[PDB]
Amino acid sequence: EQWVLNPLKVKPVAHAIWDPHFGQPAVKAFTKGGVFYPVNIATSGVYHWWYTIGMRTNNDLYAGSLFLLFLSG
Amino acid sequence: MTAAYLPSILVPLIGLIFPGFVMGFAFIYIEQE
């Protein structure tokens, strides 16, 4: 939601990191993307892809995930 | 009970319990007459 505003400046985050082996330096080093917890920055381009498709809110992505779970079932 | 607790609740499960149980059951299955 904060990437669709300034996509050329915001780094897209893939998912959060929860590793009980990280030290405080590692947590601080990985806390980026404007979030407040260690994260991975996506390199798959799914952000750009979905933005182009027409996804704007997190609710759109959540609805898509629900539909794909239903389709897998 | 918020969603923020789910990573801490699950990662140990998926990473130590699920592998341990799967390994034990698979061991029992593969070594079984």
Partner: peptide
Amino acid sequence: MISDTQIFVALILALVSLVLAIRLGTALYQ
């Protein structure tokens, strides 16, 4: 922004898919 209720609905659908996956795995194993 994604609420705990939304995450719980997702988890329920995931559990349903897991049950169906176990059924398919059994049917294929036969």
